[PDB]
Amino acid sequence: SAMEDFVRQCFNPMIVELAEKAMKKYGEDPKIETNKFAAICTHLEVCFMYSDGGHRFEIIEGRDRIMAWTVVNSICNTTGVEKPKFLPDLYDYKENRFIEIGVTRREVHIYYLEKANKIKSEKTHIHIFSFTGEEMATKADYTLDEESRARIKTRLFTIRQEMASRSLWDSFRQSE
Ligand SMILES: [Mn+2]
Ligand SMILES: [Mn+2]
């Protein structure tokens, strides 16, 4: 498949290996769920760029569940922040809050409403990125500076356009 080829060419080997183990754990093959493969890789990469945009951020995403819940619990015991019911993506030590990162092929406000209805904790901050340079965040507080968010949005647009040059974007956007 071309989608798997694109994933292995454009994403860093570490991100690809993380996405593959995350899928293989639940019985999913990246050679069939190729759009899900690309989506996991893209989300992981966004989380890592977000965390490097500051150290200000703790990466929860990408860790095995044991190590991730260990990190979340250590944060909760040293800070007193309430424990999330779902594993979030990052922790902001400056704002002292968990962040849930979303990357959507659809409208930012659709996905934002979906995520907010999912987590149901006003504590966890929501930040949604689109592939069109659009973004939506809790209380319109975008946490990061304009340069870091422009970095993320450029990378997302580039993934979309490299998918389009391979005639893969149409499959990808109708797959969420
Ligand atoms: Mn996550
Ligand atoms: Mn997420």
Side-chain angles (χ1 to χ4, degrees), residues 95-117:
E95 304 281 1
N96 292 284
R97 58 183 190 226
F98 289 107
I99 317 168
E100 174 59 44
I101 294 299
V103 190
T104 186
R105 286 93 91 182
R106 291 169 289 160
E107 316 222 65
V108 288
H109 65 78
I110 290 329
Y111 198 44
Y112 178 97
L113 269 310
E114 205 171 293
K115 271 289 182 44
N117 192 52

Side-chain angles (χ1 to χ4, degrees), residues 11-157:
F11 288 106
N12 176 279
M14 155 188 201
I15 282 153
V16 166
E17 206 216 311
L18 293 165
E20 282 191 277
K21 57 153 208 82
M23 298 184 68
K24 302 317 224 133
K25 267 206 279 232
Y26 302 154
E28 327 190 41
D29 186 20
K31 310 216 198 244
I32 296 91
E33 296 322 308
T34 56
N35 297 357
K36 183 190 208 143
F37 196 12
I40 300 191
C41 289
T42 300
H43 183 259
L44 266 162
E45 198 179 63
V46 164
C47 290
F48 293 166
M49 298 181 55
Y50 209 106
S51 81
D52 194 56
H55 95 297
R56 187 193 161 159
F57 298 96
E58 202 61 64
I59 317 199
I60 300 332
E61 189 59 77
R63 307 175 174 269
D64 48 294
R65 284 187 164 112
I66 286 165
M67 199 203 195
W69 276 116
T70 296
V71 178
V72 169
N73 165 264
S74 174
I75 284 151
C76 291
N77 293 335
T78 57
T79 60
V81 193
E82 73 146 10
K83 226 183 101 172
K85 210 159 161 83
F86 305 86
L87 257 201
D89 289 327
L90 307 149
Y91 182 79
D92 193 333
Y93 285 109
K94 164 175 321 224
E95 304 281 1
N96 292 284
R97 58 183 190 226
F98 289 107
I99 317 168
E100 174 59 44
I101 294 299
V103 190
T104 186
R105 286 93 91 182
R106 291 169 289 160
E107 316 222 65
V108 288
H109 65 78
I110 290 329
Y111 198 44
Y112 178 97
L113 269 310
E114 205 171 293
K115 271 289 182 44
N117 192 52
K118 164 216 185 107
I119 58 155
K120 302 168 282 244
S121 165
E122 254 189 322
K123 275 303 145 223
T124 309
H125 211 91
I126 310 266
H127 197 159
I128 308 287
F129 290 95
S130 80
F131 291 83
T132 73
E134 272 182 342
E135 61 179 351
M136 192 162 276
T138 302
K139 260 168 98 178
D141 172 24
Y142 294 103
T143 294
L144 229 42
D145 48 296
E146 296 294 300
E147 191 202 32
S148 299
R149 276 148 51 214
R151 221 201 326 141
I152 298 167
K153 291 191 256 192
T154 304
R155 176 68 181 139
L156 288 177
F157 201 82

